[PDB]
Every structure is written in C-alpha cells, then in structure tokens.
Design a protein around this ligand. Sequence first.
Ligand SMILES: Nc1nc2c(ncn2[C@H]2C[C@H](O)[C@@H](COP(=O)(O)NP(=O)(O)OP(=O)(O)O)O2)c(=O)[nH]1
Ligand SMILES: [Mn+2]
Ligand SMILES: [Mn+2]
Length: 538
Amino acid sequence: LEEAPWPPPEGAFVGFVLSRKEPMWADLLALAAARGGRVHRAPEPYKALRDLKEARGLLAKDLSVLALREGLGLPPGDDPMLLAYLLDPSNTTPEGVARRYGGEWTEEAGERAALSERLFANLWGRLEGEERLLWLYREVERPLSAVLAHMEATGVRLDVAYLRALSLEVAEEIARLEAEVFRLAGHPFNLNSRDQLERVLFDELGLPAIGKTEKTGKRSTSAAVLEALREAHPIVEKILQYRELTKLKSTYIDPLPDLIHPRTGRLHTRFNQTATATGRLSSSDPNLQNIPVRTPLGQRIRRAFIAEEGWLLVALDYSQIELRVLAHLSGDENLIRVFQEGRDIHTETASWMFGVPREAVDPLMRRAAKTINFGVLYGMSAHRLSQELAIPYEEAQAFIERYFQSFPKVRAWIEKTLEEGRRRGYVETLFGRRRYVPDLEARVKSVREAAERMAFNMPVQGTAADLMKLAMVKLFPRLEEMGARMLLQVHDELVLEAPKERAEAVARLAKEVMEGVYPLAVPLEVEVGIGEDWLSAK
DNA sequence: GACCAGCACCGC
DNA sequence: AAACGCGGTGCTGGTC
Ligand SMILES: Nc1nc2c(ncn2[C@H]2C[C@H](O)[C@@H](COP(=O)(O)NP(=O)(O)OP(=O)(O)O)O2)c(=O)[nH]1
Ligand SMILES: [Mn+2]
Ligand SMILES: [Mn+2]
C-alpha cells in the first residue's frame, strides 16, 4: 500500500496497537488507517484519535473504549470479527480470523489497518445472500458494540474499604480452618494443592475414592466428591469451607479493590462480543458475570457493588428465560400454558425437592431447583440426578420421565433440531444465529451424544442471548435521554444506574422495553428492583 | 518474568 | 464424578 500522510479520509479502516489487552488500562502505542489503496500512520497516536469520526476495523470496540476513556466520542462501526463470528462462532480471535479469510494478524498498526480493510471486504462478500445473518449484524451486533463500549468505559462503583475490612475478617477464619485441617491430617501440607490433598484423603486417611479427573485420571477432590464424603471424616467439612472462603477471597474480595481505575474511581470489565459458541457475551478482566451471590459471604460481596452518590442501581432479570424460549421454539401447548397462567417452574421444583410450601422457598433452594430443571432438560442422567436430589436412582429416573411427559412437544423439538443439525451441519437460533456441530455424525457414541447436548442447547441459550442483545440495543438510547447509565449485563440481566429522582421511571421503562423486545408465544416477564447496592436491587 | 495444562469453583 | 449447557479465574505444578 502507498504510505500517505495522516489524517486518512472519512470511512477508513483503523489499526491500533495496545500495550495490554484491557482498553481502559492500555497505552495506545500506535495508530494507523487504510483506504483507497493507501495507509496512514499517525505520528502521535493519542492526538491522532481526535481525527477519527468512527472506529472501523478489527476490535473496533476496544479502541472506542479507549477513546471514551480519553473523553472522545468515537463510536465503533464495522468490525470483521463480528462478521466472522456470525458466519461461525468458532471465529473468536483475530489470529484465527486473519489466517482463515486472507491475512496475518501482526503487531504493527499499519498492517492491522490494511488487514481490517482486506478482511472486511472478503467477509462481507461471504455474507452476501445470508439475509438473516446480515440482519443480526446490522440490527444487533454492530449497534451493540457501541452499547458495550459505553458500558465498559463507564464502570461500576465498588466499596473498597468495605472489601478491605472483609478480607482481614475472612483471613482469620481461613487460618482457623487451615489449622483445623492440619491437626486432623497430623501434619502440615499445602491445602491448595489438590495432589497433596488427594494423598491425605485417600492414602493417609484411607477415605474411599468416588471419581477420577478427566485428563490425568487422578482421584478427584472436587466439591461433588467431598460432598459425598461429608460424613466420612470431620476433615471433609473443614475442607469444603476452606475451599469456599479461599475461592471468594482469592477471586473477588482481594483482587477487585486493586482494579479501581485512578481516573474514574470505578471498576471496569470487558464485554467480549465474539467469545462464545451460542451467541452469549462473556466478561473478563475482571469477570463481573459470576460475582458471588449464593452464600451469606457471597451476598456480602454483592453489597460491595454500589451506586454513585445520589444515584440508585436498577437490576432487571428475565424470569425463567430459557424455559419461556423453549415454549416458543418447541410450541408445547402445556409449557406455554404454564407461563400464561403465571406459574414458576423453579419454585415448583424447589417446593417438591425440599418438601415445603412455595412461600418457604428461599433463594438458595431456588438455585438448587434451577440446576435440576435445566440439568434434566439438557440431558442430565438419572445417576447424577439421584445424587443431586439425594433420592434413590429409581425415583430419579421417574423424575426425568414425568418432566418430559409433561411437555411432549419438547422431545419432538429436540429430535427435529438434531436432525436438521445433522443434515445442514449447524443449528440455529430464532433469529438465524448459527453454531456448527459436525460431531453430530461422529462414530463414537460418547462424542456424538456430547455434541447432541451442545447442539439442541444452542438454539435455546442462543435465542435468549439474541433477545437480551436486541433489548440492550433498544434500551440504550432511551436511557441516554433519561440521564441513566447501563453498567453491567449478566446474560439475561441488566444493572443500570439512574439519578435517585429518576430511578423509578427508568425501572418502569427498562422493564417494558425488555418484556416487549420481541413478542413470543409466551409473555416475557422481568423482575425489577432498586437499591443502593447490587444485592438490594435484586 | 511469561506461558501453559490441569484441576477446581464462581454464576448465568 | 456421573450423558446438563455456556463461560472466566485462582492455584498448583511445570516449562522456558
Ligand atoms: N444449562 C443450564 N443453564 C443455566 C443454568 N443456570 C442458568 N442457566 C441459564 C438458563 C436460565 O434461564 C438463564 C438465566 O439464568 P437465571 O436468570 O439465573 N435463571 P432463570 O432466568 O431461568 O430464572 P429466574 O430469573 O426466574 O430466577 O441461564 C444451569 O445450571 N444450567
Ligand atoms: Mn432470569
Ligand atoms: Mn439472571
């Protein structure tokens, strides 16, 4: 390409190099652009950002986030990654997309700009005729990237002092647990080492080995195994408690306070748009889509996520989302009637397994019911179900029988989905998002049946993701007009931040937008709450 | 220091 | 652990 002077013409494809993957923390090391057979390299990247009206190219969102960090309104536009991701969700990295569609992903901005131009031309050509995939690109993914950019650049407020004090408290308790484990073992050892713990439990203490690990075939010390051994030795109980606290302390309590950005004073995650096989987003650096919430200590961690002074958090979460999607996709009249009558399958399964009235079901019980309802739906075995439900194997097999017998159209849909996946080689969501599942024709049963479970799950989970994404695209401009912020997304949930005097109005509006994003054969219901912290708003 | 495989874990 | 699915992160143990 002919090297031309900065700036480039409007509509050029951008290429950029970051000192680190996180745009909110990265130094913009180089900036370049390409169009019309030319390449423009910026003398000073930061100054050069002011010259762009739109970020078109690979990882456009990341550059837009960095521009927002610097107070620049540089929205993301076309991104070859989103085109490749829609053609095949296994296209998740620029390294692979480049090598697959005509280029090489290097570490030079000028080459990345030229690569973005070449890959867009080729990928856009491959989507000619894919009307449904082009609709998802034009109406969902491309506009969503702008929404995610603003979310990432905004961040969430965290109660640092609260978590600092919590760290010191949990530390003392971990010391009491580790000292108790060492005494029962008769000697000290690295309790974090599952190899050393394996010997203590199964060689020294002589406890029975329940299961083995996948790759190396060692005797597993997983929670499920230890749960089965909860009454075989007092050490097992202390280990489970040690595992819980060290996990929450090492992954959330201690790391998150150190990630507050100096310029914003807030915590900034990344929402990765081409990371999953089903169309879901993912969150990383740090992951804010798996913040603790189940246990009492987990709830205390949620409370650390707070609203800015004078603001309130608004949390909206779809009710029984994939079950409602399943009703629409399958067309089972019985399942449809469940939601038309306002029933809650999670509560009903919870009341059955715990033997208590509906009003006695606590959040912990309901989460346990979710595992069963979705576990059974997506192919859980009676053997595992018997252990999860703590019932005889014969009763567990009966549970799976009544489950599908209650909704006979579900099985018919599963077989229709798998058959089409075998013939076409991919399954699709309600909006046409595809996932290629070639192992549906595999000759090894284990491999084949694994692909099958992945296959007919993707339309359900993927449609829910399509719906959530479309709702985010619709809702974002409405929140801007009301002075509200979109902070976090958790697959079927949104966390917003609104002025105290507008929180009620935002909550009502966001609820309506989410529930009416795309009318289905069943109503989409959203649970909404308002509070100064994430747990309160739930 | 950086990277990795493997086990284990958090929540959707 | 096991015939639920989708992710990301910490630790250990190992390498370079
Ligand atoms: N296969 C599978 N899918 C799951 C699991 N947990 C969550 N999902 C999927 C299916 C879920 O629909 C979706 C959202 O998870 P939630 O919002 O926590 N549960 P929901 O919306 O169903 O119920 P409600 O909001 O009334 O409490 O994530 C699981 O253990 N397994
Ligand atoms: Mn939900
Ligand atoms: Mn949810």
